[PDB]
Amino acid sequence: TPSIEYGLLSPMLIVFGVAIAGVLIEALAPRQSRYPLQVTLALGGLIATVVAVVFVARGLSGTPGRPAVLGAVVLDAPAVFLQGTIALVGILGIMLIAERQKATVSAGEARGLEDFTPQASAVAGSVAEQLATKTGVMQTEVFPLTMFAIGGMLLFPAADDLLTMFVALEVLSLPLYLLCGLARRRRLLSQEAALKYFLLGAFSSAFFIYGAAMLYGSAGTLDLSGIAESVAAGSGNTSLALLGVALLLVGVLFKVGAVPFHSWIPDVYQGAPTSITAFMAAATKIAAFGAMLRIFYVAVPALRDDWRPVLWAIAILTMVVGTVTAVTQTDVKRMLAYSAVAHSGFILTGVIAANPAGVSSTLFYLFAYGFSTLGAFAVVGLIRNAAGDEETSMAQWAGLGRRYPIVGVVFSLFLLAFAGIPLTSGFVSKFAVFKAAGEGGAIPLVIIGVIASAVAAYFYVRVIVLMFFTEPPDDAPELVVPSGLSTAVVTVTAAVTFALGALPQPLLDLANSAETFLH
Amino acid sequence: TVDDKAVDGTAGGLAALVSRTSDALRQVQTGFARSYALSMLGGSALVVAAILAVQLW
Amino acid sequence: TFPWLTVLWAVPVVGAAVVILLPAAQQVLAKWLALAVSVLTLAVTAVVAIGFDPAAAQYQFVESHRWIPSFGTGYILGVDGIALALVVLTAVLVPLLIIAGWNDASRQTGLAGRSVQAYLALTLAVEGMVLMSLVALDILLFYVFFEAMLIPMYFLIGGFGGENRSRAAVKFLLYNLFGGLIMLAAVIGLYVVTAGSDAFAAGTFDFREIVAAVSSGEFAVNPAIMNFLFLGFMFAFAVKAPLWPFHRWLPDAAVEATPASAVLMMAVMDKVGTFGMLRYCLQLFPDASTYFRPVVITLAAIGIVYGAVLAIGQTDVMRLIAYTSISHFGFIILGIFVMTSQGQSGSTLYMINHGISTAALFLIAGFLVSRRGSRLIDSYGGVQKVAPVLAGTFLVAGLATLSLPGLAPFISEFLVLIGTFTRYPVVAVFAATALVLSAVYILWTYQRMMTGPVRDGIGDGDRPVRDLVPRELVVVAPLLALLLVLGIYPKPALDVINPAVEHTLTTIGQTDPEPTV
Amino acid sequence: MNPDNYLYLSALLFTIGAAGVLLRRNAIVMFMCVELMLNAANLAFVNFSRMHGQLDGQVVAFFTMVVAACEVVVGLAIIMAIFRTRRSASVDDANLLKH
Amino acid sequence: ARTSTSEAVVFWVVGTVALVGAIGVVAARKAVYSAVFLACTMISLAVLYIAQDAPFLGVVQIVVYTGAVMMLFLFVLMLIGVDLTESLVETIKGHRIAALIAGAGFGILVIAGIGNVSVAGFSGLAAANSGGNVEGLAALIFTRYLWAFELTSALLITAALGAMVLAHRERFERRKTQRELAIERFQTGG
């Protein structure tokens, strides 16, 4: 019989079982009790996942990783590190998702402070939507779907086979496609975002599977270890291998947001629910870059001389176009999305390093940046126009910091982390990736990313200018708490973003210990 | 005059160039899913780059 | 041994945190607590200086700890003569700036009433980061705090300050941060080069170890790579310390920010750029620095003359002072890169003297500007009649910046000029022209504002120019006393500076040329 | 006939499918084109499995079929929502997010 | 490597049909025509799978894609139109030419990258299909790929959840029953 390492799969199994249990709650639980259970089932579940991870991590203190399901899944140090990062980010994202309306005379608060329309199938602004809002109904199906996303995402770094990694890509993509279209406010934009994300993601996934086919043809094996053995031994075709690497790179780059594939990120981040947008921008990037790391440092290191240049052309672009485009942006959400494109480029610079320092720097970069992005988007979700819609217009943020100094300082901290100012986790993060690139002979990327960061500092700083140095307008937006969960998310995220800047050696030792994959 | 037009002029020109390039690039974000799909299919650039890396640049 | 430097740099930061955390209703108590924190930092600096033995090892009060071994960077503090001079300057100035900006933040509304607390906390944070940068003996730690100290000053400009505070703050932060990122490029290049050399166990940022390795010749590097690293460091420090033509950010920031913050910028913060030049650019890349010496010497001399000329041409008092500071920084850099004992010692003493002198002059001009509502030179006239003390102190500060021998700056400028001639006579004369140019742009401004008939609204009207209030006297008198003391008897400073400079020269294989006779 | 023809056909089909996603506004036609692309990938997998004398490629093709079905269903749900709100299934109609 | 002549003819005819079906899907001005062409392409690909020693895969292709294309035809009727003739005129300036160029270039580059591969040896699948093709597939799926097999259940659940959340109208939009519609004041009646 096939040996199954349940202990190693423990975090993944916990997450997927919790998702299935949440679907059961949706099925056979009364409406009034669905939300208390789901969130309780969800957050606790993720907490268990985190616990599982550390246990697995401790188990990995011996063998340098080990396959779990007869290949097709490998939990080595990078895999467990990324899984723990994704688990923490998912906990925070679900706490953001579970936020309900602050308070009202009627008890019909409907998970709206998290931007989720009470009835997604209901037409925007229709009498049915208004009645659903009044009755306080909520589609708790969000919590299962989100868990599934996390599930697939937890798998995506750990997938040691092309088939499993493709399945994980689809499993994480579909729930996100659905979630993009559930926004409570600006429903038309959210539905457009869902459609765009679905179309481009399906297109990219077709490319990903075609590349997997090409790699399988070249190497005659789907395990990444087998592909590496074949390409190194020269047994493969060596042209199908390169073509498959390119096509698979297309899919992963789309998932992370390289410039040739970035265009979806701005629209999707602007249109998707703010909580979903935050959780996405952090954890999906983490998972996609984990898979990319596995592909390049395990599956196909031998062809470094072949794919190294291509990534250069992308990384440069991702640093340039991602930043230069953000310069003229006037929407906070859109500006942050372009910032995410640029930070994908910065990650790719470390990935290009092709050295263990590259792996460690990328892992730390992903952790710190995922936290910073989650916090920034969570904060953005609180700036509410008079009508209640998120005042994403940057001009409307003028004097926001003066009205709300604490939230303003927190958002400025996140912005400076993105800009990579020292004493912020962002600087340690950028320094790690650029140092890894320099040690890897890619110091021209260090220079170009330095210039790109200088450019991006402008649009990171303009927000602070509006927020603090400008007098508030007459119709300036107002904060909405809206509950303890959102404040906890924001404070935890800011605390991490500051601690990893001041005192990064913690978790940097962890990143260093996870600089080696189970080749 | 040198300070106001030449020295400050270089920084002003750099900023103007960055702004013009930003506007041009933002014009690429047409908002049509099909245009984004075309850009992604520009991944033929990735394919040809990977192949040519073996064809001596 | 108590961690004296750690306390020195931490006290301002901890005090800033406490002050900002204070309740809004404690504005007066917040001011007094910030002043107390600054005075405590000054006391720490005093004990460090007193315990400092200029005849002892190059670096003293050295503290070493592992901070980020993964990056080959350690929490290494240590003060030499050069660092000690700037540490003393910052520690003495910051309390005076606080009592100068006592009421600057009162007019700002909103911010949950923390305007005064925010201003004081930002000033204290700037002090702490500046001190930490000065005492840092690790390249990466030094860069961390060198780039970090921008953001508090960025807030301090954009927050508070004049109408154009937003644009001024943006230009400040972006120029300095572009330079800092160009530094980061060279810092990572240095890490890569050190890692690729057998002279170190791995990539290293320990300043002392790298300096020893390069001096001993074990850490040989391709001259092109060293040249590029030196260029990155130099560009960063040239934007930081406004070396011409990278100066263009300073005038706007200085004019737009509050006078206390502007002084903190030019008098204290910008000195960090020149200090970074003197220490890192010379001791890490002696060959590259020697190779580029002609170019940067020419740039510094051009900066001197050009800044003096612009100051002559300015119609705004504060902008005029800003350009004067640019020219003085030109002197500082010229003295640093002539690589002469006289030149470098004079440049360090000029760091100190210019800090104090520009603080005095800019603060007096800020008081005068506050009395009225316009910074225009032509907006004033005959202010001596109405405010004899204000005009007298302005005259004394200008004479200091004018480099009178009775005041400290001359001893420094002279020392620099001397050092310049022993290697570059023509550049020395070209710089010496700034002696006349300073007389021009100081005394013409004094004539325009302080002399002649009392202009309308100066001695009467709703906004008369009242003489200096007691607090402004508290701010001014110590600065003028320091100028007089360091002009008459500079030896106590030089006794500290001269050893370190010698070591620096000894490290970079440079020696003052012997006389021809 | 050389077996590589099977791959070339796939390369054509995938290409054609890609072109469809670029040329056709109807969301349903886009789903059909995505199905074409995924089935071209399946054909490549089947050919490679035959070449290597093992059934792994066929299993991957089966899983790709499952993925294609699930993706099509999700896209159909999204298009139902967008049509109910907008009364149109044209992707070009969802153009609000731009610049 | 050379395949059987009869297999060559099967490939030529069926792949010509599949290519024409794909071209029709892309170019059919009527959406129902595109669905029919998609069905033709899927069935042709199933026949090719059968020819490539993948009987179960081909038959499953026919079954599932017959069902799926029928559902797509239903949705074409529901959302696009019964016999609506789409214009297919380029609405995005210069997008048609750019898309055609990009597709042609990508296909050319993919084919160039593929090059000649079967020349490097083409093992007969008979060794693996020995003992039953379906049995070999079962052995692989439930031993080597059981993890992906299980995750397909998560894919199914996510699809069902998405369909319910986005498409299932709730009580507030339930159409009135004939009984309900037969009582309004006096329903139609009066």
PDB file of all heavy atoms in Angstrom, chain C residues 202-224, unseen atoms left out:
ATOM      1  N   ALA C 202      33.470  36.282   5.278  1.00  0.00           N
ATOM      2  CA  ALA C 202      32.300  36.369   4.416  1.00  0.00           C
ATOM      3  C   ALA C 202      32.057  37.838   4.112  1.00  0.00           C
ATOM      4  O   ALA C 202      32.866  38.702   4.454  1.00  0.00           O
ATOM      5  CB  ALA C 202      31.072  35.728   5.070  1.00  0.00           C
ATOM      6  N   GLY C 203      30.934  38.112   3.459  1.00  0.00           N
ATOM      7  CA  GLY C 203      30.542  39.487   3.241  1.00  0.00           C
ATOM      8  C   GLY C 203      30.499  40.220   4.564  1.00  0.00           C
ATOM      9  O   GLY C 203      29.915  39.726   5.532  1.00  0.00           O
ATOM     10  N   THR C 204      31.125  41.391   4.626  1.00  0.00           N
ATOM     11  CA  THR C 204      31.317  42.075   5.895  1.00  0.00           C
ATOM     12  C   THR C 204      30.946  43.541   5.745  1.00  0.00           C
ATOM     13  O   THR C 204      31.109  44.134   4.676  1.00  0.00           O
ATOM     14  CB  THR C 204      32.766  41.942   6.375  1.00  0.00           C
ATOM     15  OG1 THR C 204      33.057  40.564   6.641  1.00  0.00           O
ATOM     16  CG2 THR C 204      32.993  42.749   7.633  1.00  0.00           C
ATOM     17  N   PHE C 205      30.438  44.117   6.836  1.00  0.00           N
ATOM     18  CA  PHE C 205      30.150  45.542   6.905  1.00  0.00           C
ATOM     19  C   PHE C 205      30.884  46.219   8.055  1.00  0.00           C
ATOM     20  O   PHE C 205      30.697  47.420   8.268  1.00  0.00           O
ATOM     21  CB  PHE C 205      28.645  45.785   7.053  1.00  0.00           C
ATOM     22  CG  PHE C 205      27.876  45.619   5.778  1.00  0.00           C
ATOM     23  CD1 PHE C 205      26.853  44.696   5.690  1.00  0.00           C
ATOM     24  CD2 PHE C 205      28.166  46.393   4.673  1.00  0.00           C
ATOM     25  CE1 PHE C 205      26.141  44.546   4.526  1.00  0.00           C
ATOM     26  CE2 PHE C 205      27.458  46.243   3.506  1.00  0.00           C
ATOM     27  CZ  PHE C 205      26.442  45.322   3.434  1.00  0.00           C
ATOM     28  N   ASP C 206      31.695  45.484   8.807  1.00  0.00           N
ATOM     29  CA  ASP C 206      32.476  46.090   9.874  1.00  0.00           C
ATOM     30  C   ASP C 206      33.443  47.104   9.282  1.00  0.00           C
ATOM     31  O   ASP C 206      34.348  46.745   8.525  1.00  0.00           O
ATOM     32  CB  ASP C 206      33.231  45.011  10.646  1.00  0.00           C
ATOM     33  CG  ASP C 206      33.877  45.544  11.910  1.00  0.00           C
ATOM     34  OD1 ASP C 206      34.180  46.754  11.966  1.00  0.00           O
ATOM     35  OD2 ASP C 206      34.082  44.750  12.850  1.00  0.00           O
ATOM     36  N   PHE C 207      33.246  48.376   9.627  1.00  0.00           N
ATOM     37  CA  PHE C 207      34.050  49.432   9.027  1.00  0.00           C
ATOM     38  C   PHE C 207      35.522  49.268   9.374  1.00  0.00           C
ATOM     39  O   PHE C 207      36.391  49.398   8.506  1.00  0.00           O
ATOM     40  CB  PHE C 207      33.544  50.797   9.487  1.00  0.00           C
ATOM     41  CG  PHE C 207      34.354  51.941   8.969  1.00  0.00           C
ATOM     42  CD1 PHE C 207      34.364  52.241   7.622  1.00  0.00           C
ATOM     43  CD2 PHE C 207      35.112  52.712   9.826  1.00  0.00           C
ATOM     44  CE1 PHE C 207      35.109  53.291   7.141  1.00  0.00           C
ATOM     45  CE2 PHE C 207      35.861  53.762   9.351  1.00  0.00           C
ATOM     46  CZ  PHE C 207      35.859  54.054   8.007  1.00  0.00           C
ATOM     47  N   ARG C 208      35.823  48.986  10.641  1.00  0.00           N
ATOM     48  CA  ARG C 208      37.217  48.895  11.057  1.00  0.00           C
ATOM     49  C   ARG C 208      37.935  47.759  10.340  1.00  0.00           C
ATOM     50  O   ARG C 208      39.062  47.932   9.861  1.00  0.00           O
ATOM     51  CB  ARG C 208      37.295  48.712  12.571  1.00  0.00           C
ATOM     52  CG  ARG C 208      36.572  49.795  13.347  1.00  0.00           C
ATOM     53  CD  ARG C 208      37.124  49.945  14.750  1.00  0.00           C
ATOM     54  NE  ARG C 208      37.108  48.685  15.483  1.00  0.00           N
ATOM     55  CZ  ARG C 208      36.056  48.205  16.130  1.00  0.00           C
ATOM     56  NH1 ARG C 208      34.899  48.846  16.142  1.00  0.00           N
ATOM     57  NH2 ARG C 208      36.166  47.053  16.785  1.00  0.00           N
ATOM     58  N   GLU C 209      37.298  46.592  10.252  1.00  0.00           N
ATOM     59  CA  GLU C 209      37.937  45.449   9.609  1.00  0.00           C
ATOM     60  C   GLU C 209      38.200  45.728   8.136  1.00  0.00           C
ATOM     61  O   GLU C 209      39.289  45.448   7.623  1.00  0.00           O
ATOM     62  CB  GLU C 209      37.066  44.204   9.774  1.00  0.00           C
ATOM     63  N   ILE C 210      37.211  46.284   7.436  1.00  0.00           N
ATOM     64  CA  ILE C 210      37.382  46.565   6.016  1.00  0.00           C
ATOM     65  C   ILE C 210      38.460  47.617   5.808  1.00  0.00           C
ATOM     66  O   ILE C 210      39.266  47.524   4.875  1.00  0.00           O
ATOM     67  CB  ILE C 210      36.045  46.998   5.392  1.00  0.00           C
ATOM     68  CG1 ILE C 210      35.048  45.841   5.422  1.00  0.00           C
ATOM     69  CG2 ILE C 210      36.255  47.471   3.967  1.00  0.00           C
ATOM     70  CD1 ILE C 210      33.613  46.275   5.271  1.00  0.00           C
ATOM     71  N   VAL C 211      38.480  48.644   6.656  1.00  0.00           N
ATOM     72  CA  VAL C 211      39.493  49.687   6.536  1.00  0.00           C
ATOM     73  C   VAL C 211      40.881  49.095   6.728  1.00  0.00           C
ATOM     74  O   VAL C 211      41.815  49.389   5.972  1.00  0.00           O
ATOM     75  CB  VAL C 211      39.220  50.814   7.545  1.00  0.00           C
ATOM     76  CG1 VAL C 211      40.449  51.683   7.714  1.00  0.00           C
ATOM     77  CG2 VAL C 211      38.043  51.645   7.094  1.00  0.00           C
ATOM     78  N   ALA C 212      41.038  48.253   7.749  1.00  0.00           N
ATOM     79  CA  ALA C 212      42.328  47.620   7.984  1.00  0.00           C
ATOM     80  C   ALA C 212      42.730  46.763   6.793  1.00  0.00           C
ATOM     81  O   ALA C 212      43.887  46.780   6.362  1.00  0.00           O
ATOM     82  CB  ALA C 212      42.274  46.782   9.258  1.00  0.00           C
ATOM     83  N   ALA C 213      41.778  46.008   6.245  1.00  0.00           N
ATOM     84  CA  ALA C 213      42.090  45.132   5.123  1.00  0.00           C
ATOM     85  C   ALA C 213      42.530  45.930   3.903  1.00  0.00           C
ATOM     86  O   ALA C 213      43.501  45.566   3.233  1.00  0.00           O
ATOM     87  CB  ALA C 213      40.880  44.264   4.789  1.00  0.00           C
ATOM     88  N   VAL C 214      41.829  47.023   3.596  1.00  0.00           N
ATOM     89  CA  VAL C 214      42.194  47.809   2.422  1.00  0.00           C
ATOM     90  C   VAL C 214      43.534  48.497   2.635  1.00  0.00           C
ATOM     91  O   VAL C 214      44.365  48.557   1.723  1.00  0.00           O
ATOM     92  CB  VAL C 214      41.090  48.824   2.069  1.00  0.00           C
ATOM     93  CG1 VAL C 214      39.808  48.104   1.705  1.00  0.00           C
ATOM     94  CG2 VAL C 214      40.852  49.792   3.206  1.00  0.00           C
ATOM     95  N   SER C 215      43.771  49.030   3.837  1.00  0.00           N
ATOM     96  CA  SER C 215      45.039  49.702   4.097  1.00  0.00           C
ATOM     97  C   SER C 215      46.206  48.729   4.018  1.00  0.00           C
ATOM     98  O   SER C 215      47.231  49.027   3.395  1.00  0.00           O
ATOM     99  CB  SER C 215      45.000  50.374   5.466  1.00  0.00           C
ATOM    100  OG  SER C 215      44.642  49.441   6.470  1.00  0.00           O
ATOM    101  N   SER C 216      46.066  47.554   4.634  1.00  0.00           N
ATOM    102  CA  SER C 216      47.137  46.568   4.612  1.00  0.00           C
ATOM    103  C   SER C 216      47.379  46.011   3.219  1.00  0.00           C
ATOM    104  O   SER C 216      48.422  45.394   2.985  1.00  0.00           O
ATOM    105  CB  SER C 216      46.815  45.425   5.575  1.00  0.00           C
ATOM    106  N   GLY C 217      46.443  46.205   2.293  1.00  0.00           N
ATOM    107  CA  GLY C 217      46.579  45.715   0.942  1.00  0.00           C
ATOM    108  C   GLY C 217      46.045  44.318   0.724  1.00  0.00           C
ATOM    109  O   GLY C 217      45.981  43.870  -0.427  1.00  0.00           O
ATOM    110  N   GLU C 218      45.659  43.617   1.791  1.00  0.00           N
ATOM    111  CA  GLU C 218      45.117  42.272   1.628  1.00  0.00           C
ATOM    112  C   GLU C 218      43.830  42.296   0.816  1.00  0.00           C
ATOM    113  O   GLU C 218      43.607  41.429  -0.037  1.00  0.00           O
ATOM    114  CB  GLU C 218      44.875  41.638   2.998  1.00  0.00           C
ATOM    115  N   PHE C 219      42.973  43.284   1.062  1.00  0.00           N
ATOM    116  CA  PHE C 219      41.686  43.389   0.377  1.00  0.00           C
ATOM    117  C   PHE C 219      41.829  44.206  -0.908  1.00  0.00           C
ATOM    118  O   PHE C 219      41.225  45.260  -1.091  1.00  0.00           O
ATOM    119  CB  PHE C 219      40.648  43.996   1.316  1.00  0.00           C
ATOM    120  CG  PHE C 219      39.286  44.153   0.705  1.00  0.00           C
ATOM    121  CD1 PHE C 219      38.849  43.303  -0.292  1.00  0.00           C
ATOM    122  CD2 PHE C 219      38.438  45.152   1.142  1.00  0.00           C
ATOM    123  CE1 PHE C 219      37.598  43.454  -0.845  1.00  0.00           C
ATOM    124  CE2 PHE C 219      37.186  45.305   0.593  1.00  0.00           C
ATOM    125  CZ  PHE C 219      36.765  44.456  -0.399  1.00  0.00           C
ATOM    126  N   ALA C 220      42.654  43.690  -1.811  1.00  0.00           N
ATOM    127  CA  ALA C 220      42.813  44.317  -3.114  1.00  0.00           C
ATOM    128  C   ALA C 220      41.531  44.172  -3.922  1.00  0.00           C
ATOM    129  O   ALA C 220      40.873  43.129  -3.889  1.00  0.00           O
ATOM    130  CB  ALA C 220      43.984  43.693  -3.868  1.00  0.00           C
ATOM    131  N   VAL C 221      41.176  45.227  -4.650  1.00  0.00           N
ATOM    132  CA  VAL C 221      39.962  45.246  -5.454  1.00  0.00           C
ATOM    133  C   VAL C 221      40.276  45.869  -6.804  1.00  0.00           C
ATOM    134  O   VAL C 221      41.145  46.739  -6.922  1.00  0.00           O
ATOM    135  CB  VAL C 221      38.826  46.021  -4.755  1.00  0.00           C
ATOM    136  CG1 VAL C 221      37.565  45.990  -5.601  1.00  0.00           C
ATOM    137  CG2 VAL C 221      38.564  45.442  -3.376  1.00  0.00           C
ATOM    138  N   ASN C 222      39.560  45.421  -7.828  1.00  0.00           N
ATOM    139  CA  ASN C 222      39.720  45.988  -9.153  1.00  0.00           C
ATOM    140  C   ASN C 222      39.448  47.490  -9.090  1.00  0.00           C
ATOM    141  O   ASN C 222      38.397  47.898  -8.573  1.00  0.00           O
ATOM    142  CB  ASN C 222      38.767  45.322 -10.141  1.00  0.00           C
ATOM    143  N   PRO C 223      40.350  48.335  -9.591  1.00  0.00           N
ATOM    144  CA  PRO C 223      40.142  49.782  -9.435  1.00  0.00           C
ATOM    145  C   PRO C 223      38.818  50.269  -9.990  1.00  0.00           C
ATOM    146  O   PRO C 223      38.258  51.231  -9.457  1.00  0.00           O
ATOM    147  CB  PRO C 223      41.331  50.383 -10.194  1.00  0.00           C
ATOM    148  CG  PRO C 223      42.384  49.352 -10.093  1.00  0.00           C
ATOM    149  CD  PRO C 223      41.664  48.041 -10.189  1.00  0.00           C
ATOM    150  N   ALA C 224      38.296  49.644 -11.045  1.00  0.00           N
ATOM    151  CA  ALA C 224      37.013  50.078 -11.587  1.00  0.00           C
ATOM    152  C   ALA C 224      35.888  49.862 -10.582  1.00  0.00           C
ATOM    153  O   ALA C 224      35.032  50.738 -10.396  1.00  0.00           O
ATOM    154  CB  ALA C 224      36.718  49.333 -12.887  1.00  0.00           C
TER     155      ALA C 224
END
